[PDB]
Amino acid sequence: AAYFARRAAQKERVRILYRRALKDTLNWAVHRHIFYRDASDLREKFNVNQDVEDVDRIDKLIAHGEAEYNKWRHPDPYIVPWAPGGSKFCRNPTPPAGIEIVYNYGLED
Amino acid sequence: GITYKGVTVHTPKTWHTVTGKGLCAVMWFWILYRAKQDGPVVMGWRHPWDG
Amino acid sequence: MYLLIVFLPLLGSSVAGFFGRFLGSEGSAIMTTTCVSFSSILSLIAFYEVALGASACYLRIAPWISSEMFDASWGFLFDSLTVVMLIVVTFISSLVHLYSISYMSEDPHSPRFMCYLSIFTFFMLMLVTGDNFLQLFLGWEGVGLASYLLIHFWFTRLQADKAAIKAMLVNRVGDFGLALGILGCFTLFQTVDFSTIFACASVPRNSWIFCNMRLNAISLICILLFIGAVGKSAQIGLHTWLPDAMEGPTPVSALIHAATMVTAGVFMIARCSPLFEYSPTALIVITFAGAMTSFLAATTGILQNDLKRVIAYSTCSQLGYMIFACGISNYSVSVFHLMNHAFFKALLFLSAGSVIHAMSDEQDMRKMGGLASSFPLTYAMMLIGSLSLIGFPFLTGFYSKDVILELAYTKYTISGNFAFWLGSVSVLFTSYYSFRLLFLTFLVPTNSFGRDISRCHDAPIPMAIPLILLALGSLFVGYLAKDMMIGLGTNFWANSLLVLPKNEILAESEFAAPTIIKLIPILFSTLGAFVAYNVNLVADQFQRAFQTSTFCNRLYSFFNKRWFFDQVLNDFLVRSFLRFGYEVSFEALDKGAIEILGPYGISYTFRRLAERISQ
Amino acid sequence: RWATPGHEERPKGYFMNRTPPAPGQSR
Amino acid sequence: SVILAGILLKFGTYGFLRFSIPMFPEATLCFTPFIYTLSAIAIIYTSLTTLRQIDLKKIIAYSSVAHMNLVTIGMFSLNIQGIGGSILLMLSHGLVSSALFLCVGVLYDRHKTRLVRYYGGLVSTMPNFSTIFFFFTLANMSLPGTSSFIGEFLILVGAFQRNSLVATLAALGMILGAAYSLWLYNRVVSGNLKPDFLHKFSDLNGREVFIFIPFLVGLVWMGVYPKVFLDCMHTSVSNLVQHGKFH
Amino acid sequence: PLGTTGEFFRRRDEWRKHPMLSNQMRHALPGIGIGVGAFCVYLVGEQ
Amino acid sequence: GGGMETNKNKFIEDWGSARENLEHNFRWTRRNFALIGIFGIALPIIVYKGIVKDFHMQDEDAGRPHRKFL
Amino acid sequence: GDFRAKVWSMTGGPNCRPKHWRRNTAIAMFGVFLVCIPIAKLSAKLEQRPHMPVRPIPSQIWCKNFGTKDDYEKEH
Amino acid sequence: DDHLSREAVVDRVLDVVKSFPKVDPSKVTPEVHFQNDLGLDSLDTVEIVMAIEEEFKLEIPDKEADKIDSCSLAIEYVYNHPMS
Amino acid sequence: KPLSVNDELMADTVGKYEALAWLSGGLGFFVGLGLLAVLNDKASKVPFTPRVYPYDNLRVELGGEP
Ligand SMILES: CCCCCCCCCCCCCCCCCC(=O)O[C@@H](COC(=O)CCCCCCCCCCCCCCC)COP(=O)(O)OCC[N+](C)(C)C
Ligand SMILES: CCCCCCCCCCCC(=O)SCCNC(=O)CCNC(=O)[C@H](O)C(C)(C)COP(=O)(O)O
Secondary structure, eight states, X not given: OIIIIITHHHHHHHHHHHHHHHHHHHHHSOSHHHHHHHHXXXXXXXXXXXXXXXXXXXXXXXXXHHHXXXXXXXXXXXXXXXXXXXXXXXXXXXXXXXXXXOSSOSOOO | XXXXXXXXXXXXXXXXXXXXXXXXXXXXXXXXXXXXXXHHHHHTSOOSSOO | OHHHHHHHHHHHHHHHHHSHHHHHHHHHHHHHHHHHHHHHHHHHHHIIIIITTTOOEEEEOOOSEESSSOEEOSEEEEOHHHHHHHHHHHHHHHHHHHHHHHHTSSOTTHHHHXXXXXXXXXXXXXXXXXXXXXHHHHHHHHHHHHHHHHHTSSTTOHHHHHHHHHHHHHHHHHHHHHHHHHHHHHHHHSOOBHHHHHHSSSSOOOEEEETTEEEEHHHHHHHXXXXXXXXXXXXXXXXXXXXXXXXXXXHHIIIIIIISSSSHHHHHHHHTHHXXXXXXXXXXXXXXXXXXXXXXHHHHTTSOOBHHHHHHHXXXXXXXXXXXXXXXXXXXXXXXXXXXXXXXXXXXXXXXHHHHHHTTSOOBGGGOOOOTTTOHHHHHHHHHHHHHHHTOSSSTTHHXXXXXXXXXXXXXXXXXXXXXXXXXXXXXXXXXXXXXXXXXIIISOOOSOHHHHHSOOOOOSTTTHHHHHHHHHXXXXXXXXXXXXXXXXXXXXXXXXXXXXXXXXXXXXXXXXXXXXXXXHHHHHHHHHHHHHHHHTSOOOOTHHHHHOHHHHHHHHHHHTGGGHHHHHIIIIIHHHHHIIIIIIIIIITXXXXXXXXXXXXXXXXXHHHGGGGO | OOSSXXXXXXXXXXXXXXXXXXXXXXX | OHHIIIIITXXXXXXXXXXXXXXXXXXXXXXXXXHHHHHHHHHHHHHHHXXXXXXXXXXXXXXXXXXXXXXXXXXXXXXXXXXXXXXXXXXXXXXXXXXXXXXXXXXXXXXXXXXXXXXXXXXXXXXXXXXXXXXXXXXXXXXXXXXXXXXXXXXXXHHHTTOHHHHHHHHHHHHHHHHHHHHHHHHHTSSOOOTTTOOEEOOOOHHHXXXXXXXXXXXXXXXXXXXXXXXXXXHHHHHHHOSSOOO | OOHHHHHHHHHHTGGGXXXXXXXXXXXXXXXXXXXXXXXXXXXXXXX | OOOOSOOOOHXXXXXXXXXXXXXXXXXXXXXXXXXXXXXXXXXXXXXXXXXXXXXXXXXXXXXXXXXXXX | OXXXXXXXXXXXXXXXXXXXXXXXXXXHHHHHHHHHHHHHHHXXXXXXXXXXXXXXXXXXXXOOOBSOTTOGXXXX | OOOOOHHHHHHHHHHXXXXXXXXXXXXXXXXXXXXXXXXXOSTHHHHHHHHHHHHHTOOOOHHHHTTOOBHHHHHHHHHHOXXX | OOOOXXXXXXXXXXOHHHHXXXXXXXXXXXXXXXXXXXXXXXXXXXXXXXXXXXXXXXXXXXXXXX
C-alpha cells in the first residue's frame, strides 16, 4: 500500500507546492518579461532533486520546501475579481431558487 | 479592431483621441505660458515689483 | 433661494426613494441629477452673491431644542467659508451623479444608489451650512450614516459589511469626541450658536475639573473637537476605516471619501478657528497629528497594488497636509488646499473607475499595462490629475502644497520643524507612488489577460463630461483662486476665518526664506518620479532580495499591511472587547453569581426546609 | 436606452402583498 | 413585551421623579454619587453584554437597560437639561423600543424562531420591513432627527454641568449602542439568504404597515420639533428641580 | 526565454507584442508636440 | 413544503439552548472568583471614588468645603 | 430571478423599468416644482442680510431684509 | 455576453497545449493523456494547467487543479464553469 | 458537528506580539524624530524679530481696555 499511496501522496504534494510557488513567483515579479527566468529557476529547484528514490530523505525536503514557501509567500496575492476572496465576488449574485413569497398572510377569518 | 493572435484591440473613436490630445496640449501650453509670466519670480531672480 | 440650495437634494432623494417604482432606473437618475444640478447653479449664484458681493445671509427657520438656555435652532449660516464648501460639495455631487448615470447602467438597483447619493449630499449641505453646534452635529452624523449605507450598497458581499461597520465604529468614536467638545462649549458660554461662542471666545481664562484632572477650559474643548476631526478625517489616531471603505462603488469613493466627508474635519477646524485660536496647546496637537498622518499615509501608499487603495492613501496624505496647515494657524491655505484637492482627487477616482469599469472590474495594477494607446482620454485625464497631485509647477496642486510647505518652514517652533520635515519627505513619497500608479497602469508592457483587452470601451459621454470639467478645474481653478484666498491682506474671508495678529506668518512665507526652500517640493517630486521610473519601467528587478532577505520581506509586509494597524488594533482592542463582552460580563457577573445568591440558586432550600415541618 | 418603452407594465409584487380584487369590484 | 418595556419599565423612573427626587431633597444629594456609579457601570456592562447575545428579543431587551439607566443619570442631575431631557428619553424609548418589539413580533409570527443565525437576507424578500426596521435601528442608536437623540443629548448636557466624569462614562453608551444596533441589522436584514433554513416569506400586511405609521410620525415629530413637548413641562420640571432650595 | 518553463510562457505571450500594446512610451506625453508648437507660435508672434 | 416555519437544525438549536441554559454552569473556580471580585467589586469602587473625588475637587475650586457624601 | 418579480418595493426592485416612466418622470418634476415654490417663498421672507451688497445682487429682487439689523442694540 | 461554444473552447485549449516546447504537436487529439499519450514530466502538467487558467481568465481552486491530467478533462472544466 | 460556544465572532505571516513590536518601532521612529526636532531648537534660530503692531499691539481692536 505504501508503494502506491505513501509515495504517491508526496507526488501530489509536490505538484501542489509547484503550483503555489509558480503563482507566488508570478505575483512577486510583476512584469511578464522578468517572470520567465524566475520561473525557470524555480523549476530548476525541483528538477535537480529528481535524482532521489528513497523516502528516507525526500520527505524532509518537502517539509523544508513548504517551510520556505510559507515565509517567502507574497503578503498580498492576486485573486481574480469574481473568484472567492476577490473584489467582485458576491457583487450581484444569482438569487437562490425555490424561494417563494406568499400573499394575504395575515387576514382575519 | 485589429487581431494579432486571436486577441483583438478595438480602436478608440476619434472623439476620445482628439479630446485627450487637446486637453494635454492645453495643459502643456498653460504650463509654458505661466513659466513665461512668473517663472523668474519663483526662481527668485526678480520680485514682481518689491525689488 | 438659499433654502432651495439645501432642500433640493432632500426632495430628489425623497422622490427617487419613495416613488422609484414609477420612475424606474432612468427617472430616478434624472430626478436626483436635475435636483443636484439646480442646487449647484444656485450655489453658483450664492458664490456670486455672498463671497464676491460680501453680504452674508443668516436664516433661522424654527427653534429645534429649547431648554432654559440650551437653544440650538434650525439656523443656516452662509458666509465666505460656507459658500466655498457649497460650491465644492454640490458641484462635485452633481458631477458624481452624472458619472453614476453611465457607471450604474447595468447594476440592477440603480435608483437606491442615487437616492443614497442625494441624501448624502443633503446631509453634507446641512453640515456645511450649520449655524449651531447641533445642526453641525446633525450633519456630522448623518454624513456618517450615509457613508455607511453607501459602503455596503452591495449587501451580499461580506467585506463590504465589515468595512461599513468598521467605518461606523471609527466615526462613532469621532462622534463621541465631538459630543464631548459640544458639551464643553455649552458649559462655558451657555450657548451652542457660532456667533455668540466666537464673540465670547476670548474672555474665558478659567480652569475646569475634567476626569480627575484640572485642565484649561478652552484647551480641553479644542482638543475634544480635534478628536472628532481626527475621527472623520482619518488622521493618525483613527484612519484605518478609510482604506477599507473602498469596497463601495467607485462614485462612492470619488465623492464620499475624496472630496467630501474627509474634509469635514478640516472644515470644522477652520470654522471653529475663532475658538481654536485661543488655545495654543491644541494647535501643537493638530500640527503633530497632521504631520504624522501625512508621513504615515505616504509611506503606506508606496507598496499597494490595488488601484483604488493607492489613491485612498493619497487622500489621507492630503488631509494630513490640510490638518497641519490648520495647525500653523493659517486656515485660508487649508481651505484653499481643500478646494484644490477636491478637484484633482475626484478626477483621479473618476478616471480610475473609468479604467476599472472598462477592464471588467480589474483592480490590480499587476494585471494592467499598455492602456495608454487603448484609453487615450482617460490616460490624459489621469496624467493631469497625477501632475496636479504631485505639485507640478504652475498647476492646481502647486499653488497650495508649496505654500503649505514654505509656511511650515517659517513657523520657527518645535512643532513646526517636525511638520516641515514630515511634509517634505511625504512629497517625495507621494511623487513616487503617484508615478508608480501612472506607470504600471498605462506605460509598462502589457501584463493583463487577452479577455480584458478584447472587451475594452473608453468612457462614454455621461462618464466624460464630469471628467473634462474636473480637468479644467484641476488646470485653472487653483490659479484663479490663488489671489482671493491666500493673498496678502485679502478680505474675501471677511469674518469667516480669524487669525490672531501674533500668529500671522503669511507675509514672511513669501520673502523671508532662501529660494532653495521654495524648490524643495519640485526637487523631491523629480527624485520620486526618477526612482519610480527606474524601479518600474526599466530595472533588473532585484526582487530576489525580497526572496533572500528576511528583513526585506518583513519590511515589505510592514508597509503593505498599513503599518500593522489593522492586525494589532484588532487583536488588542476588538478581540479583547469581544472577550470582555462574554467571558466576564455575561459569563460571571450576571450568569449564576446573582442566581446562586438569588431566588433559586440557594434560596430553593425552602424545599429542604418546608418539608421538614412534619417534625 | 433612454427612448425605448419599459417592459414592466405594473410594478412587481402587490402592494402590502394583497392580490387585487375582482374586476369591477373594490377591496 | 410591549407593555412590559413600554410602560412597566417607566414605573421606577416615575416613582423616583414623583416620590424620591422632591420627598427627600437632602437624601437625594447624598446618594447622587451612588446612583451615578450604578448607572455608569450599568451602561457600560449592559451595552457590552448585548454584543454576545443570540436571541432577537434578548438583544433589544438589553437595549432598554442601557437606555433606562441613562435616564436615571438625567433625573439625579437636578437641572432643567437633565430632568427635562430625561422625560423625552422615556417617551422616545416608549416608542422606539416598543416599535422594535413589533418588528421582532413580525418576524416571530411568520417564522417561529428568534435566533439571529436563522435570519439573513431579508432585505431581498421583505423590503418594507427592512426599511421600517432600519429606521427604528437608527432611532435606537441615537441619531439626530429622532426623538432619542434629543433626550440623549439633553441628559448629557445636564450631567456634564454637575460631573464631567459621569457624562464621559455615559457618553460611551452611544459608542456601544451604535455597535450592536447596526450589527444586529446587518445580520438580520443584510446578507445572503439561507433557503436551507427558511424559504417562504411575506412582507408587512395592512395591519403592520398601519401599526408602524404612528410610531414613524411620532418619532420624527418629537425628533425635529420637540418644543411642543418641552414647553408643556418646563413650568412643572423647574418646580421639581428646587424644593428645599430657597435661593 | 531560458529554460523549458520560460520558453513555454514566453511563447504563450506572443500576443503581447500587439502594435497597439507593444510600445507606449511614445505615447507617454500625449500633446507635448502640439502644445510646444502653439507656444512657439505665440512667443514668436508677440514681438 | 407549504410552511413558513423554520427548518430548525439540531446543532443550532442545541447550541442556543446551551448558551441560554448557562445558569447552572458555574464550578466556583478561582477564575470565576477572581473575575467577579475584580470586575464586579473593584471597578465599581474605582468609579465611585472617581465621582466622589470629582465632586471634592469641584468643591475646593470654588472655595466651598467638601460635601459629606455619606 | 423568478421570485424577485413577486416582491413589492418602493424603490422598484432590480432592473425596474416601467412602460410609462417618461410620463411619470414629467409628473415628478412638476410635483417637485410645486413643493419648491413655498420653500422659496418662505426662504425669501425669513432671510436677513445685515450688509448691503457691493454690487446689485439678484436676491434684492425678492428679499427685502437688507440693512435691517444695523440697530442691533434693540434686538430681542 | 454569450458563453463561447464547446468547439471554440477546444480551439483555444488545443492551441495552448500545442504551443509547448517539450510536446510534439504532430498528434494532439482532444482525447489525450499528458502522462500517457504525450510522455511529459509530471511537473509541466502544472504549467499547462496554469497557462490554461490565465488564458481563459479563471482561477481553479488548488484542490482539483492537479486533477486535470488530460485535455478532455480541461475542456470540460473550462466549459461547465459559468463565469468564464 | 456541534457549534462552538463562541460561534458569533468568527496578516497570517505575523504574530500579534511580533507585529506589535513592529508597530512600536514604527511609532518610536516618530517619537525619535520629535526628540530630534526638540534638539534642533528652531525657536532660537528665528531670523526676524517678533512682529510689533501699532496702537500698543492693537490692544483696543483686539478687545482690550479702551
Ligand atoms: C431619520 C433621520 C435620518 C434619515 C436618513 C435616511 C436614509 C435612508 C434610510 C432608509 C434607507 C433604506 C435602508 C433600509 C432598506 C434597505 C434597502 C431596501 O430594501 O429598501 C428598499 C426600499 O427602498 C428604499 O430604500 C426606501 C428607503 C429610502 C428612501 C426613502 C428616504 C426618503 C428620504 C430620507 C428621509 C427624509 C428626511 C431625512 C432627513 C431627516 C429598496 O429595495 P431595492 O433597492 O429595490 O432592492 C432590494 C431587492 N428587492 C427589490 C428584491 C427587495
Ligand atoms: C515562495 C517560495 C517559492 C518556492 C521556493 C522553493 C520551494 C521548494 C524548495 C524545495 C523544492 C525541492 O527541492 S523538493 C520537491 C521535489 N523534490 C524531489 O526530490 C523530487 C523527486 N522526484 C519526485 O518526487 C517525482 O519523480 C515527481 C517529482 C513527482 C515526478 O513524478 P514522476 O515519478 O512521474 O517522474
